[PDB]
Amino acid sequence: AAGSLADLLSDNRPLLKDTIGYLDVIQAPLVEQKQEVSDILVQMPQALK
Amino acid sequence: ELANALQDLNRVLKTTREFLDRNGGVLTHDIDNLEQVTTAILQPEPRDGLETGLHAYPNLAANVLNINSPNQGGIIGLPVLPGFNYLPFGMNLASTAMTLPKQIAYSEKRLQPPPGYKDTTVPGIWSRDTLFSHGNHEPGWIVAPGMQGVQVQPATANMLTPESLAELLGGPDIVPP
Amino acid sequence: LEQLRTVSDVLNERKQDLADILTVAGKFITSLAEALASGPYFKVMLVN
Amino acid sequence: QHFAETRDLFADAVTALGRLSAAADETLSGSNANLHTNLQNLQRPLKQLGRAAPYLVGALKLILTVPFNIDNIPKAIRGDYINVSLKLDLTLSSVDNA
Amino acid sequence: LVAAVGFGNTGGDIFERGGPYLVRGAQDLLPTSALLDEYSPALFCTIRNYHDAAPKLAGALGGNGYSLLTNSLVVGVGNPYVYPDNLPRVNAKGGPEGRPGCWQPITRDLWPFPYLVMDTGASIAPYNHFELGQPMFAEYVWGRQVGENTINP
Amino acid sequence: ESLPQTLANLEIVIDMLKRYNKNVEQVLVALPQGAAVAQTGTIFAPEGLLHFGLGINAPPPCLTGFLPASQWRSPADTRTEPLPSGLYCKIPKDAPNAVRGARNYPCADVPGKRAATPRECRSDEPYQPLGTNPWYGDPD
């Protein structure tokens, strides 16, 4: 298990670093405009009906 | 072996302790929220709703992309008259030019007809472009590669040649002349 | 992780609304796409 | 003497760590390559969603329904029948294009 | 040693319950990850264009506050979809110019969107000219209709 | 008790997306062209283009498998009612009318089959139409 974790970290570390950076970029506007997201989620089912 | 093992174990214990004390409460909170939302959207009724959405949305997208006439813009709709259910007779006088030859673009380069052939209402089936070739009247049509599974009517199978009629159902792709 | 926390919180408060969207958008999509199917247009009933 | 007193506890600790590590090893070896492939594939969508992140909330108003906009549905559609204004165009330009 | 016993038991139970799930999820995510990666170039432009068009489509519904404002001109309709050839397919792929992407924002300098032809079982590409409707006259009593149904108008 | 459930739910979602991979790809191809179409059709700011096709009863509407005539609501009533389930054109896979309807949608999981909903795709009971659509009432 120690070897398996070392292998899974040695190969995926740069990709996880890039993934976390991209996740920060994606998440920042969602946090900035979270009230809008909540409002559209509340509003949409009635329009769909 | 043992010296490096002990020192690295000490360092990783300290690092793990700091990482846990910093991030564990929020990591656990995020995992709990993810579990709650995914369980909420995977209930029986949401499950079948997602199933039917994935099943019947691409057809909706395709059909609504086929109601848009580029030359006139917008969408096209005709005024049906229900309520007897409807009239015994119907008429379709003429079909005006929805598109132009210079406007057509192809999603894949295998769907583009070669010289001497023109596109039909079924993508991938290429007619012959002549003066008398309107309304399945010019024999010798061909088919795009990888178009298996489109069963046709007896009318269009006569003009479609044996090789391409086979390729519609059989395996090998025709070699265009 | 913290911004994912707030996003996931506002999403989890709206988990029932996501379920409602998935439920109701799956029980009319086949019906509403039916109009488009008959020809290259869509049927419309004009009551006026 | 102390080790002989706590031999059972040492064996329990080793066996518990082994029970954890067996499942951990099988999970981390069965997912080492699929996770790498999925991360390498998702790199481009993650970057393009990071670029399109500011417009995502504004886009959401339309990207699902498309010809309908969620904001003004409750007043345009009064239940069964969609309200619409019929501006019949008989201008020579529209007659030409049609 | 006691803490090792407790942590080993807890982590072992967690991994036994949720390890096969993770492995098979990462196995099943390969085709969908490849599909999402293939159509990355059409991601930013699609979201940007829908964001731009959202106020424009909202103004139509909300300007009157009670209706939808439409410009209507009479036009000719294409031939109805035929039974065996026009049946739906889900083999669509690609994008504009053969690769995934978006058209440049449609101003009035370049108004008509280039129609995109893809594997769908239906198209409106061959409507380049004025022709009479192939089922010109139809009857719904004995199903007798003049003209020949075709995919080649 | 939360991480295993999260992983199980993610596995379910990924399985559902994998079985319907072609559907997702088709929607991803159609969306940018839909944005382009909207841009083309909204060149006039307050008015959206919507044309009307000439010709009467070219394809007739099918009332089979939909709400009965007596159950229609008067246009005055703006009140909202719960939307019915399982309503689509139930003609026996024939005629040019409603060729591309729900009944002909391909089944992703079951090769070589067409059905309206995945529940009907999975079921082995044969698809029998509710009735041919007549012009003289009783569409049933």
PDB file of N, CA, C and O in Angstrom, chain B residues 66 71 87-99 103 105 107 109-111 118-121 123 127 133-136 147 151 155-156, chain E residues 75-77 84-85 93-95 97-98 111 114-119 122-125 127-129 131-133 136 138-140 148-152:
ATOM      1  N   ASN B  66     -33.155  21.578 -37.063  1.00  0.00           N
ATOM      2  CA  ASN B  66     -33.691  21.397 -38.408  1.00  0.00           C
ATOM      3  C   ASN B  66     -34.890  22.287 -38.718  1.00  0.00           C
ATOM      4  O   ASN B  66     -35.406  22.224 -39.837  1.00  0.00           O
ATOM      5  N   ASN B  71     -31.759  31.243 -44.585  1.00  0.00           N
ATOM      6  CA  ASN B  71     -32.001  32.355 -45.501  1.00  0.00           C
ATOM      7  C   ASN B  71     -33.037  33.328 -44.963  1.00  0.00           C
ATOM      8  O   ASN B  71     -32.949  34.531 -45.229  1.00  0.00           O
ATOM      9  N   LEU B  87     -59.376  17.979 -41.232  1.00  0.00           N
ATOM     10  CA  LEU B  87     -59.930  17.907 -42.575  1.00  0.00           C
ATOM     11  C   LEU B  87     -59.438  16.653 -43.294  1.00  0.00           C
ATOM     12  O   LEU B  87     -58.283  16.252 -43.122  1.00  0.00           O
ATOM     13  N   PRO B  88     -60.289  16.015 -44.102  1.00  0.00           N
ATOM     14  CA  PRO B  88     -59.863  14.799 -44.816  1.00  0.00           C
ATOM     15  C   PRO B  88     -58.754  15.034 -45.822  1.00  0.00           C
ATOM     16  O   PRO B  88     -58.041  14.084 -46.164  1.00  0.00           O
ATOM     17  N   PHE B  89     -58.582  16.259 -46.305  1.00  0.00           N
ATOM     18  CA  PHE B  89     -57.638  16.561 -47.368  1.00  0.00           C
ATOM     19  C   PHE B  89     -56.585  17.546 -46.883  1.00  0.00           C
ATOM     20  O   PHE B  89     -56.814  18.319 -45.948  1.00  0.00           O
ATOM     21  N   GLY B  90     -55.427  17.507 -47.531  1.00  0.00           N
ATOM     22  CA  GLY B  90     -54.343  18.414 -47.207  1.00  0.00           C
ATOM     23  C   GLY B  90     -53.567  18.766 -48.456  1.00  0.00           C
ATOM     24  O   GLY B  90     -53.643  18.073 -49.474  1.00  0.00           O
ATOM     25  N   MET B  91     -52.811  19.858 -48.367  1.00  0.00           N
ATOM     26  CA  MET B  91     -52.071  20.359 -49.514  1.00  0.00           C
ATOM     27  C   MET B  91     -50.734  20.926 -49.066  1.00  0.00           C
ATOM     28  O   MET B  91     -50.635  21.543 -48.002  1.00  0.00           O
ATOM     29  N   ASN B  92     -49.709  20.710 -49.889  1.00  0.00           N
ATOM     30  CA  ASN B  92     -48.365  21.247 -49.671  1.00  0.00           C
ATOM     31  C   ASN B  92     -47.917  21.825 -51.010  1.00  0.00           C
ATOM     32  O   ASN B  92     -47.321  21.116 -51.826  1.00  0.00           O
ATOM     33  N   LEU B  93     -48.214  23.109 -51.231  1.00  0.00           N
ATOM     34  CA  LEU B  93     -48.056  23.699 -52.558  1.00  0.00           C
ATOM     35  C   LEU B  93     -46.601  23.707 -53.008  1.00  0.00           C
ATOM     36  O   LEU B  93     -46.276  23.224 -54.098  1.00  0.00           O
ATOM     37  N   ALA B  94     -45.709  24.245 -52.182  1.00  0.00           N
ATOM     38  CA  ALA B  94     -44.327  24.413 -52.606  1.00  0.00           C
ATOM     39  C   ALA B  94     -43.429  24.550 -51.389  1.00  0.00           C
ATOM     40  O   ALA B  94     -43.876  24.922 -50.302  1.00  0.00           O
ATOM     41  N   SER B  95     -42.149  24.252 -51.594  1.00  0.00           N
ATOM     42  CA  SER B  95     -41.126  24.384 -50.563  1.00  0.00           C
ATOM     43  C   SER B  95     -40.108  25.411 -51.037  1.00  0.00           C
ATOM     44  O   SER B  95     -39.378  25.167 -52.005  1.00  0.00           O
ATOM     45  N   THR B  96     -40.056  26.555 -50.362  1.00  0.00           N
ATOM     46  CA  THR B  96     -39.136  27.611 -50.746  1.00  0.00           C
ATOM     47  C   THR B  96     -37.725  27.296 -50.254  1.00  0.00           C
ATOM     48  O   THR B  96     -37.504  26.390 -49.448  1.00  0.00           O
ATOM     49  N   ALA B  97     -36.760  28.063 -50.755  1.00  0.00           N
ATOM     50  CA  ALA B  97     -35.350  27.800 -50.478  1.00  0.00           C
ATOM     51  C   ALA B  97     -35.032  28.146 -49.031  1.00  0.00           C
ATOM     52  O   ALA B  97     -34.961  29.324 -48.666  1.00  0.00           O
ATOM     53  N   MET B  98     -34.844  27.121 -48.198  1.00  0.00           N
ATOM     54  CA  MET B  98     -34.403  27.358 -46.829  1.00  0.00           C
ATOM     55  C   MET B  98     -32.923  27.715 -46.768  1.00  0.00           C
ATOM     56  O   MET B  98     -32.533  28.613 -46.015  1.00  0.00           O
ATOM     57  N   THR B  99     -32.088  27.033 -47.544  1.00  0.00           N
ATOM     58  CA  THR B  99     -30.648  27.261 -47.548  1.00  0.00           C
ATOM     59  C   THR B  99     -30.171  27.569 -48.966  1.00  0.00           C
ATOM     60  O   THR B  99     -30.944  27.559 -49.925  1.00  0.00           O
ATOM     61  N   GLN B 103     -23.905  28.277 -48.235  1.00  0.00           N
ATOM     62  CA  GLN B 103     -24.075  28.345 -46.793  1.00  0.00           C
ATOM     63  C   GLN B 103     -23.852  27.017 -46.084  1.00  0.00           C
ATOM     64  O   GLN B 103     -23.636  27.015 -44.869  1.00  0.00           O
ATOM     65  N   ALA B 105     -22.410  23.902 -44.363  1.00  0.00           N
ATOM     66  CA  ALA B 105     -21.185  23.425 -43.745  1.00  0.00           C
ATOM     67  C   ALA B 105     -21.447  22.049 -43.153  1.00  0.00           C
ATOM     68  O   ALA B 105     -22.569  21.738 -42.745  1.00  0.00           O
ATOM     69  N   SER B 107     -20.478  18.914 -40.466  1.00  0.00           N
ATOM     70  CA  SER B 107     -19.881  18.645 -39.164  1.00  0.00           C
ATOM     71  C   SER B 107     -18.657  17.750 -39.295  1.00  0.00           C
ATOM     72  O   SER B 107     -17.668  17.926 -38.577  1.00  0.00           O
ATOM     73  N   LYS B 109     -15.955  15.845 -42.240  1.00  0.00           N
ATOM     74  CA  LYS B 109     -15.507  15.936 -43.621  1.00  0.00           C
ATOM     75  C   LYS B 109     -15.788  14.674 -44.422  1.00  0.00           C
ATOM     76  O   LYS B 109     -15.547  14.666 -45.633  1.00  0.00           O
ATOM     77  N   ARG B 110     -16.282  13.613 -43.785  1.00  0.00           N
ATOM     78  CA  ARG B 110     -16.726  12.431 -44.508  1.00  0.00           C
ATOM     79  C   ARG B 110     -18.143  12.568 -45.048  1.00  0.00           C
ATOM     80  O   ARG B 110     -18.552  11.749 -45.876  1.00  0.00           O
ATOM     81  N   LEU B 111     -18.896  13.568 -44.597  1.00  0.00           N
ATOM     82  CA  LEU B 111     -20.258  13.790 -45.058  1.00  0.00           C
ATOM     83  C   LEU B 111     -20.339  14.708 -46.269  1.00  0.00           C
ATOM     84  O   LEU B 111     -21.420  14.840 -46.852  1.00  0.00           O
ATOM     85  N   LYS B 118     -24.777  15.574 -54.724  1.00  0.00           N
ATOM     86  CA  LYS B 118     -25.382  16.603 -53.891  1.00  0.00           C
ATOM     87  C   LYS B 118     -26.041  15.979 -52.668  1.00  0.00           C
ATOM     88  O   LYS B 118     -26.393  14.799 -52.657  1.00  0.00           O
ATOM     89  N   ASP B 119     -26.204  16.797 -51.632  1.00  0.00           N
ATOM     90  CA  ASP B 119     -26.739  16.333 -50.360  1.00  0.00           C
ATOM     91  C   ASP B 119     -28.254  16.174 -50.428  1.00  0.00           C
ATOM     92  O   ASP B 119     -28.937  16.832 -51.217  1.00  0.00           O
ATOM     93  N   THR B 120     -28.774  15.289 -49.584  1.00  0.00           N
ATOM     94  CA  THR B 120     -30.192  14.960 -49.515  1.00  0.00           C
ATOM     95  C   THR B 120     -30.715  15.246 -48.112  1.00  0.00           C
ATOM     96  O   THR B 120     -29.970  15.655 -47.220  1.00  0.00           O
ATOM     97  N   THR B 121     -32.019  15.024 -47.916  1.00  0.00           N
ATOM     98  CA  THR B 121     -32.606  15.256 -46.601  1.00  0.00           C
ATOM     99  C   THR B 121     -32.082  14.280 -45.560  1.00  0.00           C
ATOM    100  O   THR B 121     -32.248  14.526 -44.363  1.00  0.00           O
ATOM    101  N   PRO B 123     -28.629  12.981 -44.192  1.00  0.00           N
ATOM    102  CA  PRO B 123     -27.187  13.219 -44.308  1.00  0.00           C
ATOM    103  C   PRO B 123     -26.432  11.926 -44.570  1.00  0.00           C
ATOM    104  O   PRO B 123     -26.759  10.873 -44.024  1.00  0.00           O
ATOM    105  N   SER B 127     -27.021  12.173 -53.710  1.00  0.00           N
ATOM    106  CA  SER B 127     -27.682  11.986 -54.995  1.00  0.00           C
ATOM    107  C   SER B 127     -26.744  12.391 -56.126  1.00  0.00           C
ATOM    108  O   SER B 127     -25.548  12.612 -55.931  1.00  0.00           O
ATOM    109  N   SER B 133     -32.815  15.505 -61.921  1.00  0.00           N
ATOM    110  CA  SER B 133     -32.519  14.719 -60.732  1.00  0.00           C
ATOM    111  C   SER B 133     -33.365  15.103 -59.525  1.00  0.00           C
ATOM    112  O   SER B 133     -32.941  14.865 -58.389  1.00  0.00           O
ATOM    113  N   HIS B 134     -34.538  15.686 -59.733  1.00  0.00           N
ATOM    114  CA  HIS B 134     -35.388  16.126 -58.637  1.00  0.00           C
ATOM    115  C   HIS B 134     -36.490  15.103 -58.393  1.00  0.00           C
ATOM    116  O   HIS B 134     -37.253  14.772 -59.308  1.00  0.00           O
ATOM    117  N   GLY B 135     -36.575  14.611 -57.160  1.00  0.00           N
ATOM    118  CA  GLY B 135     -37.571  13.625 -56.801  1.00  0.00           C
ATOM    119  C   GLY B 135     -37.219  12.221 -57.241  1.00  0.00           C
ATOM    120  O   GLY B 135     -37.947  11.635 -58.047  1.00  0.00           O
ATOM    121  N   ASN B 136     -36.107  11.696 -56.723  1.00  0.00           N
ATOM    122  CA  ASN B 136     -35.593  10.335 -56.958  1.00  0.00           C
ATOM    123  C   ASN B 136     -35.805   9.863 -58.398  1.00  0.00           C
ATOM    124  O   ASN B 136     -36.434   8.840 -58.669  1.00  0.00           O
ATOM    125  N   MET B 147     -22.280   4.727 -42.641  1.00  0.00           N
ATOM    126  CA  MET B 147     -23.690   5.092 -42.559  1.00  0.00           C
ATOM    127  C   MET B 147     -24.585   3.865 -42.411  1.00  0.00           C
ATOM    128  O   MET B 147     -25.698   3.824 -42.937  1.00  0.00           O
ATOM    129  N   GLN B 151     -32.339   1.974 -42.724  1.00  0.00           N
ATOM    130  CA  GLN B 151     -33.256   1.284 -43.618  1.00  0.00           C
ATOM    131  C   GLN B 151     -34.041   2.309 -44.424  1.00  0.00           C
ATOM    132  O   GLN B 151     -34.412   3.367 -43.913  1.00  0.00           O
ATOM    133  N   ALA B 155     -38.781   3.072 -52.658  1.00  0.00           N
ATOM    134  CA  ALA B 155     -38.615   4.085 -53.695  1.00  0.00           C
ATOM    135  C   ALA B 155     -37.157   4.505 -53.837  1.00  0.00           C
ATOM    136  O   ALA B 155     -36.622   4.546 -54.949  1.00  0.00           O
ATOM    137  N   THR B 156     -36.493   4.813 -52.723  1.00  0.00           N
ATOM    138  CA  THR B 156     -35.126   5.318 -52.787  1.00  0.00           C
ATOM    139  C   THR B 156     -34.084   4.216 -52.885  1.00  0.00           C
ATOM    140  O   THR B 156     -32.915   4.518 -53.149  1.00  0.00           O
TER     141      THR B 156
ATOM    142  N   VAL E  75     -44.015  31.611 -45.513  1.00  0.00           N
ATOM    143  CA  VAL E  75     -42.915  30.921 -46.178  1.00  0.00           C
ATOM    144  C   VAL E  75     -43.404  29.535 -46.588  1.00  0.00           C
ATOM    145  O   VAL E  75     -44.482  29.090 -46.187  1.00  0.00           O
ATOM    146  N   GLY E  76     -42.615  28.852 -47.414  1.00  0.00           N
ATOM    147  CA  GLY E  76     -42.910  27.480 -47.793  1.00  0.00           C
ATOM    148  C   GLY E  76     -42.210  26.480 -46.885  1.00  0.00           C
ATOM    149  O   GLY E  76     -41.089  26.707 -46.435  1.00  0.00           O
ATOM    150  N   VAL E  77     -42.889  25.367 -46.626  1.00  0.00           N
ATOM    151  CA  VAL E  77     -42.396  24.325 -45.731  1.00  0.00           C
ATOM    152  C   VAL E  77     -41.810  23.186 -46.547  1.00  0.00           C
ATOM    153  O   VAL E  77     -42.294  22.868 -47.641  1.00  0.00           O
ATOM    154  N   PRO E  84     -38.920   5.349 -43.368  1.00  0.00           N
ATOM    155  CA  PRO E  84     -37.711   4.606 -42.994  1.00  0.00           C
ATOM    156  C   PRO E  84     -36.441   5.447 -43.021  1.00  0.00           C
ATOM    157  O   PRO E  84     -35.577   5.284 -42.154  1.00  0.00           O
ATOM    158  N   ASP E  85     -36.275   6.352 -43.982  1.00  0.00           N
ATOM    159  CA  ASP E  85     -35.017   7.116 -44.037  1.00  0.00           C
ATOM    160  C   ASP E  85     -34.846   8.255 -43.060  1.00  0.00           C
ATOM    161  O   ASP E  85     -33.732   8.562 -42.675  1.00  0.00           O
ATOM    162  N   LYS E  93     -21.500  14.110 -34.560  1.00  0.00           N
ATOM    163  CA  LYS E  93     -20.120  14.288 -34.124  1.00  0.00           C
ATOM    164  C   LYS E  93     -19.593  15.590 -34.714  1.00  0.00           C
ATOM    165  O   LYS E  93     -20.287  16.275 -35.467  1.00  0.00           O
ATOM    166  N   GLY E  94     -18.354  15.927 -34.359  1.00  0.00           N
ATOM    167  CA  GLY E  94     -17.639  17.022 -34.990  1.00  0.00           C
ATOM    168  C   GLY E  94     -18.183  18.401 -34.645  1.00  0.00           C
ATOM    169  O   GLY E  94     -18.831  18.620 -33.623  1.00  0.00           O
ATOM    170  N   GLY E  95     -17.886  19.348 -35.530  1.00  0.00           N
ATOM    171  CA  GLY E  95     -18.328  20.714 -35.379  1.00  0.00           C
ATOM    172  C   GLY E  95     -18.123  21.493 -36.661  1.00  0.00           C
ATOM    173  O   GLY E  95     -17.947  20.910 -37.735  1.00  0.00           O
ATOM    174  N   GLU E  97     -16.524  23.286 -39.712  1.00  0.00           N
ATOM    175  CA  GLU E  97     -15.302  23.053 -40.487  1.00  0.00           C
ATOM    176  C   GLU E  97     -14.651  21.714 -40.149  1.00  0.00           C
ATOM    177  O   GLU E  97     -13.443  21.536 -40.326  1.00  0.00           O
ATOM    178  N   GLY E  98     -15.443  20.758 -39.668  1.00  0.00           N
ATOM    179  CA  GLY E  98     -14.966  19.418 -39.409  1.00  0.00           C
ATOM    180  C   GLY E  98     -14.422  19.174 -38.019  1.00  0.00           C
ATOM    181  O   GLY E  98     -14.189  18.014 -37.662  1.00  0.00           O
ATOM    182  N   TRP E 111     -24.838  37.553 -41.406  1.00  0.00           N
ATOM    183  CA  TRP E 111     -26.094  37.202 -40.753  1.00  0.00           C
ATOM    184  C   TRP E 111     -26.431  35.712 -40.794  1.00  0.00           C
ATOM    185  O   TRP E 111     -26.659  35.126 -39.730  1.00  0.00           O
ATOM    186  N   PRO E 114     -24.131  29.461 -40.961  1.00  0.00           N
ATOM    187  CA  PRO E 114     -23.899  28.332 -41.870  1.00  0.00           C
ATOM    188  C   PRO E 114     -24.545  27.078 -41.308  1.00  0.00           C
ATOM    189  O   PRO E 114     -24.224  26.639 -40.203  1.00  0.00           O
ATOM    190  N   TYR E 115     -25.490  26.524 -42.064  1.00  0.00           N
ATOM    191  CA  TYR E 115     -26.155  25.301 -41.640  1.00  0.00           C
ATOM    192  C   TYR E 115     -25.138  24.175 -41.495  1.00  0.00           C
ATOM    193  O   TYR E 115     -24.317  23.946 -42.386  1.00  0.00           O
ATOM    194  N   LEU E 116     -25.192  23.477 -40.366  1.00  0.00           N
ATOM    195  CA  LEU E 116     -24.250  22.410 -40.060  1.00  0.00           C
ATOM    196  C   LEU E 116     -24.932  21.065 -40.262  1.00  0.00           C
ATOM    197  O   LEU E 116     -25.980  20.797 -39.663  1.00  0.00           O
ATOM    198  N   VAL E 117     -24.332  20.226 -41.099  1.00  0.00           N
ATOM    199  CA  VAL E 117     -24.880  18.928 -41.471  1.00  0.00           C
ATOM    200  C   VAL E 117     -24.161  17.856 -40.666  1.00  0.00           C
ATOM    201  O   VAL E 117     -22.927  17.773 -40.689  1.00  0.00           O
ATOM    202  N   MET E 118     -24.932  17.023 -39.973  1.00  0.00           N
ATOM    203  CA  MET E 118     -24.378  15.996 -39.104  1.00  0.00           C
ATOM    204  C   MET E 118     -25.292  14.780 -39.139  1.00  0.00           C
ATOM    205  O   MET E 118     -26.445  14.863 -39.568  1.00  0.00           O
ATOM    206  N   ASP E 119     -24.762  13.646 -38.680  1.00  0.00           N
ATOM    207  CA  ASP E 119     -25.513  12.391 -38.702  1.00  0.00           C
ATOM    208  C   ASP E 119     -26.692  12.483 -37.751  1.00  0.00           C
ATOM    209  O   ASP E 119     -26.545  12.369 -36.533  1.00  0.00           O
ATOM    210  N   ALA E 122     -31.900  13.378 -40.613  1.00  0.00           N
ATOM    211  CA  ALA E 122     -32.725  14.425 -41.194  1.00  0.00           C
ATOM    212  C   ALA E 122     -31.852  15.633 -41.488  1.00  0.00           C
ATOM    213  O   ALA E 122     -30.893  15.914 -40.765  1.00  0.00           O
ATOM    214  N   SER E 123     -32.196  16.345 -42.558  1.00  0.00           N
ATOM    215  CA  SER E 123     -31.440  17.512 -42.981  1.00  0.00           C
ATOM    216  C   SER E 123     -32.361  18.436 -43.762  1.00  0.00           C
ATOM    217  O   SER E 123     -33.436  18.032 -44.212  1.00  0.00           O
ATOM    218  N   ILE E 124     -31.939  19.692 -43.902  1.00  0.00           N
ATOM    219  CA  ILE E 124     -32.663  20.648 -44.734  1.00  0.00           C
ATOM    220  C   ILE E 124     -31.678  21.255 -45.721  1.00  0.00           C
ATOM    221  O   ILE E 124     -31.946  22.301 -46.322  1.00  0.00           O
ATOM    222  N   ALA E 125     -30.533  20.596 -45.891  1.00  0.00           N
ATOM    223  CA  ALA E 125     -29.550  21.042 -46.874  1.00  0.00           C
ATOM    224  C   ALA E 125     -30.058  21.095 -48.316  1.00  0.00           C
ATOM    225  O   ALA E 125     -29.733  22.076 -49.007  1.00  0.00           O
ATOM    226  N   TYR E 127     -32.642  22.070 -49.746  1.00  0.00           N
ATOM    227  CA  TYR E 127     -33.655  23.071 -50.080  1.00  0.00           C
ATOM    228  C   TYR E 127     -32.992  24.355 -50.583  1.00  0.00           C
ATOM    229  O   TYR E 127     -33.077  25.419 -49.973  1.00  0.00           O
ATOM    230  N   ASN E 128     -32.321  24.236 -51.724  1.00  0.00           N
ATOM    231  CA  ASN E 128     -31.619  25.362 -52.320  1.00  0.00           C
ATOM    232  C   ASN E 128     -32.450  26.106 -53.354  1.00  0.00           C
ATOM    233  O   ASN E 128     -31.991  27.125 -53.878  1.00  0.00           O
ATOM    234  N   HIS E 129     -33.649  25.626 -53.663  1.00  0.00           N
ATOM    235  CA  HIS E 129     -34.393  26.132 -54.805  1.00  0.00           C
ATOM    236  C   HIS E 129     -35.886  26.017 -54.526  1.00  0.00           C
ATOM    237  O   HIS E 129     -36.316  25.348 -53.583  1.00  0.00           O
ATOM    238  N   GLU E 131     -39.327  24.492 -55.326  1.00  0.00           N
ATOM    239  CA  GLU E 131     -39.967  23.327 -55.920  1.00  0.00           C
ATOM    240  C   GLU E 131     -41.325  23.086 -55.289  1.00  0.00           C
ATOM    241  O   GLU E 131     -41.568  23.441 -54.134  1.00  0.00           O
ATOM    242  N   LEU E 132     -42.206  22.477 -56.073  1.00  0.00           N
ATOM    243  CA  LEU E 132     -43.525  22.109 -55.592  1.00  0.00           C
ATOM    244  C   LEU E 132     -43.400  20.990 -54.566  1.00  0.00           C
ATOM    245  O   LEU E 132     -42.503  20.148 -54.642  1.00  0.00           O
ATOM    246  N   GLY E 133     -44.295  21.003 -53.583  1.00  0.00           N
ATOM    247  CA  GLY E 133     -44.316  19.954 -52.584  1.00  0.00           C
ATOM    248  C   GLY E 133     -44.563  18.596 -53.199  1.00  0.00           C
ATOM    249  O   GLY E 133     -45.532  18.419 -53.943  1.00  0.00           O
ATOM    250  N   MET E 136     -48.020  16.826 -52.985  1.00  0.00           N
ATOM    251  CA  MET E 136     -48.720  18.092 -53.194  1.00  0.00           C
ATOM    252  C   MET E 136     -50.152  18.035 -52.676  1.00  0.00           C
ATOM    253  O   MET E 136     -50.612  18.955 -51.994  1.00  0.00           O
ATOM    254  N   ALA E 138     -52.961  15.468 -50.621  1.00  0.00           N
ATOM    255  CA  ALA E 138     -53.065  14.291 -49.775  1.00  0.00           C
ATOM    256  C   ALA E 138     -54.495  14.139 -49.284  1.00  0.00           C
ATOM    257  O   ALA E 138     -55.211  15.125 -49.094  1.00  0.00           O
ATOM    258  N   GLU E 139     -54.905  12.891 -49.081  1.00  0.00           N
ATOM    259  CA  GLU E 139     -56.220  12.578 -48.543  1.00  0.00           C
ATOM    260  C   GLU E 139     -56.056  11.666 -47.337  1.00  0.00           C
ATOM    261  O   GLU E 139     -55.202  10.776 -47.332  1.00  0.00           O
ATOM    262  N   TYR E 140     -56.876  11.896 -46.312  1.00  0.00           N
ATOM    263  CA  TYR E 140     -56.788  11.168 -45.054  1.00  0.00           C
ATOM    264  C   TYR E 140     -57.998  10.265 -44.834  1.00  0.00           C
ATOM    265  O   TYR E 140     -58.383   9.997 -43.694  1.00  0.00           O
ATOM    266  N   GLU E 148     -44.684  11.627 -55.280  1.00  0.00           N
ATOM    267  CA  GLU E 148     -43.867  10.563 -54.714  1.00  0.00           C
ATOM    268  C   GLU E 148     -43.065  11.103 -53.538  1.00  0.00           C
ATOM    269  O   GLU E 148     -42.376  12.119 -53.669  1.00  0.00           O
ATOM    270  N   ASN E 149     -43.167  10.428 -52.394  1.00  0.00           N
ATOM    271  CA  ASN E 149     -42.319  10.758 -51.256  1.00  0.00           C
ATOM    272  C   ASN E 149     -40.856  10.550 -51.621  1.00  0.00           C
ATOM    273  O   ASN E 149     -40.502   9.593 -52.314  1.00  0.00           O
ATOM    274  N   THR E 150     -40.001  11.457 -51.157  1.00  0.00           N
ATOM    275  CA  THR E 150     -38.599  11.405 -51.534  1.00  0.00           C
ATOM    276  C   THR E 150     -37.741  12.009 -50.436  1.00  0.00           C
ATOM    277  O   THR E 150     -38.221  12.757 -49.579  1.00  0.00           O
ATOM    278  N   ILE E 151     -36.458  11.665 -50.479  1.00  0.00           N
ATOM    279  CA  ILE E 151     -35.431  12.325 -49.690  1.00  0.00           C
ATOM    280  C   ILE E 151     -34.583  13.248 -50.549  1.00  0.00           C
ATOM    281  O   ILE E 151     -33.608  13.825 -50.060  1.00  0.00           O
ATOM    282  N   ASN E 152     -34.943  13.419 -51.819  1.00  0.00           N
ATOM    283  CA  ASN E 152     -34.155  14.190 -52.779  1.00  0.00           C
ATOM    284  C   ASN E 152     -35.063  15.231 -53.417  1.00  0.00           C
ATOM    285  O   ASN E 152     -35.521  15.063 -54.555  1.00  0.00           O
TER     286      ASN E 152
END
